[PDB]
């Protein structure tokens, strides 16, 4: 209950229940010893045992989820919320430590610090030190040079160039003979270039982009009664990407049907998503009917067609350098919104004052609430008029007190314009550093989420995925790589070996 | 005419040639080296903007005008009146016309709302970011410009 969804402790297995029925030792007594002290809060305890004993960044990451689960489930029943803190302390110590032994780790040596984050653990309930920081939400981890090193080369798939990527696999998607002129690592060459992720995201990119482009062409050029065939593709893809949504709810981790839906509405992306092809649906519906409900659905084409333009932002954010500005923007977004409310009240002050000071016998209309917002918002905008706003009143009949409207204009453009303007810039300028620190981070977390939804993903972008649905049926009625790194009992030794040395160099390097 | 165009065209580069020949200038070189950098940012946060004005334009022209048979013209108005939005030259009538009267299109009332976020995007968060982007990337730029220079 307290490790998550997927995991299955060694105590409610079938061999230890017939075991225990009945009633033996222990292969790895630390283990216990260490899960007992966590869970009984003995901080001092724990530390003793974590570094006696093999798999030391198992025990380390695993005590770190717990304690933090243990923090939360004290923090929701209202203890005395000293003891969430300690928790949370304990938590800490745990993560920096499994941090620290990485670092170590990866400083002596490389291969076999990437093999020890990818092999299958049998008494962690089948899950690598990848899977455990991930569940434990550790960033520092995550973001590691070693675990960017490894991600990178589960990214690359079965393939070694790395020189100058991204072009070559576009040229031998598009030119599937050039594939063959590939370096690989120790027929076949076609199956294992078309199964690599970042081949599939590539697919993936050149479909949206065609999409994109057809989204683009059809609303343009005069809408027919019955739809093109550009239409018919758009359509196509929308319906496809749907099918996709339900099956990636349906085969979700948690096995009730309102649970995967609970944990799907998580990103903003996919609720977005839900949303535009809702709407994309009722606007196709609307199409097909009479003059003006055609006209209803090409305006809700122009609205998804916002969207999916919007949308490629989520493509841009794999680039280096293009999704951390991305994730300042979506902060700086909060900032900008906390400032909008005081333009708006000095801007609707402004726009009700001249309103009703120039026109005094106006009818109760719609138009009223109108000219207050429209044309002061224009103003700050460059469009500053002298004729449109205070009219120089054969001359018409100059209104009563029609001389303060340039008056409050220029104190309104003055706060607007020098003001409110300038303390923004100042806001966003003097926290800059911070966001863009975690922003950074959050990327480099995010890289392994990435790769693991387009490792999971079929071969076929959704233009052409209805391939791909239909043999999932045919398999329906009949990971050596890419998750995990299966060993055999001498290399297991080895990295044992090999782990106990970095955590006695560890403990020496720091008493030292 | 062609080589007369031509000859317009090429004397850009011999207008701009001349910061080579301030680059002897103590002061004038790393300035140049500055600008040289700040291109690469600029570009990497021109990217996004180009994108939020495709995307203006195309809704724009797809509402007010949908009767346009393919044309080249169609692929003009996405993206000029966008950009020249940008630099101060905001028009009341060109973009959301007054629709005696001229008949009303079928969600004409969407355009101004759609360029009142469009411009808040553009003049108020990502230029705004881009200021904070370079300010804060300067002294590092600076040091490197002069030691490169000398
Ligand atoms: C509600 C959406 C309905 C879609 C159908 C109608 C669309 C018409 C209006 C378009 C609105 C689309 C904006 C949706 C983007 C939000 C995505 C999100 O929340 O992910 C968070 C995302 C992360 O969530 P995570 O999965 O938890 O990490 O963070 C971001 O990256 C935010 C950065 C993108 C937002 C800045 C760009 C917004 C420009 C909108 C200005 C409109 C210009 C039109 C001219
Ligand atoms: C003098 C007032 C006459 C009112 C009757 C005529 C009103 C027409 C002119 C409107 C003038 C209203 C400004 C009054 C605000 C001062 C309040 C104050 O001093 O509290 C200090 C207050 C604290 O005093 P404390 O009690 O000692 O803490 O500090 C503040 O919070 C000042 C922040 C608000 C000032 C910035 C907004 C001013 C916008 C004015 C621009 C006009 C736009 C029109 C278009
Ligand atoms: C590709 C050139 C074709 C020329 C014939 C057609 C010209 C028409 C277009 C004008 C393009 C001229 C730009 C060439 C400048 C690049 C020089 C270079 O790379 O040296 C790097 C140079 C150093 O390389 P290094 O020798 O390895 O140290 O670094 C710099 O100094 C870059 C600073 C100059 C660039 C900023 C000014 C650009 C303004 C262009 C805007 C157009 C305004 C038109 C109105
Ligand atoms: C639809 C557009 C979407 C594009 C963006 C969405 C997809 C996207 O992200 O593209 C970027 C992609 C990745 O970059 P790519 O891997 O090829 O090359 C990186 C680049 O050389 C960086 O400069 C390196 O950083 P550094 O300074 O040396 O340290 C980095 O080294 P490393 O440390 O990582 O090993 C290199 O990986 O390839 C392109 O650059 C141009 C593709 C052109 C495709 C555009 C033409 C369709
Ligand atoms: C004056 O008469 C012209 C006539 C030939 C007319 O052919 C037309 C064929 C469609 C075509 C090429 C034309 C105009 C708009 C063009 C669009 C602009 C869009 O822009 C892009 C812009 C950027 C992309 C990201 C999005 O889409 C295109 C998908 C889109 C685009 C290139 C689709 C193609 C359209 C011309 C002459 O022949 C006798
Ligand atoms: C074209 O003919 C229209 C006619 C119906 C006319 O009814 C009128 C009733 C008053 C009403 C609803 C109307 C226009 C201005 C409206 C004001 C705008 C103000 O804005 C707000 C703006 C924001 C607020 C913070 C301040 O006040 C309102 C207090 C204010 C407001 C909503 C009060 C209500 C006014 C329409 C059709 O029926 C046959
Ligand atoms: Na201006």
Known sequence: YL?????????????????????????????????????????????????????????????????????????ENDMVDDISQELNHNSRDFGQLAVELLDQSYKQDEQLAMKLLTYELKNWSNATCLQLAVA???????????????????????????????????????????????????????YEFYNAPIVKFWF????????LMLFNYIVLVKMERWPS???????????????????????????????????????????????????????????????PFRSDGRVIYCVNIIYWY????????????????????????????????????????????????????????????????????????????????????????????????????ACYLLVANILLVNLLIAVFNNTFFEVKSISNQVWKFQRYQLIMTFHERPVLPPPLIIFSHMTMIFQHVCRDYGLKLFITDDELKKVHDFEEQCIEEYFREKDD
Not at 204 to 211: E, K, M, N, R, S
Not at 342 to 363: C, D, H, K
């Open 204 to 211: 993936y990119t050149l479909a949206y982009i065609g999409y």
């Open 136 to 190: 434990a939400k550790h960033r520092d981890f995550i973001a590691h040079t070693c675990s960017q090193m490894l991600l990178t080369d589960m990214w690359m798939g079965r393939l070694r160039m790395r020189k100058n990527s991204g072009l070559k696999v576009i040229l031998g998607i598009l030119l599937p003979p050039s594939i063959l002129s590939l370096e690989f690592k120790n027929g076949r060459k076609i």
């Open 310 to 409: 919007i949308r490629l932002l989520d493509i841009f954010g794999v680039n280096k350098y293009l999704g951390p500005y991305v994730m300042m923007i979506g902060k700086m977004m909060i900032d900008m919104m906390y400032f909008v409310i005081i333009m708006l009240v000095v801007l609707m002050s402004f726009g009700v004052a001249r309103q009703a000071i120039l026109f005094p016998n106006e009818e109760p209309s719609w138009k009223l609430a109108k000219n207050i917002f429209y044309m002061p918002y224009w103003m700050i905008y460059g469009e500053v008029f002298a004729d449109q706003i205070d009219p120089p009143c054969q001359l018409p009949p100059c209104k009563t007190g029609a001389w303060i409207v340039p008056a409050i204009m």
């Open 3 to 75: 490790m998550g969804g997927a995991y299955r402790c060694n105590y409610t297995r079938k061999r230890f229940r017939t075991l225990y029925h009945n009633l033996n030792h222990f292969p790895f007594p630390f283990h216990e010893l260490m899960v007992w002290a966590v869970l009984m809060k003995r901080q001092k305890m724990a530390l003793f045992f974590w570094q006696h004993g093999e798999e030391a960044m198992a025990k380390a990451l695993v005590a770190c989820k717990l304690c933090k689960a243990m923090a939360h489930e004290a923090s």
């Open 229 to 291: 065939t550009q239409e018919w593709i758009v359509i196509s893809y929308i319906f496809t990407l749907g099918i996709e949504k339900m099956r990636e709810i349906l085969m979700s981790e948690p096995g009730k049907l309102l649970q995967k839906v609970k944990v799907w509405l998580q990103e903003y992306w996919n609720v977005t998503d839900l949303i535009a092809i809702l709407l994309f649906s009722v606007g196709m519906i609307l199409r097909l009917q009479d003059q």
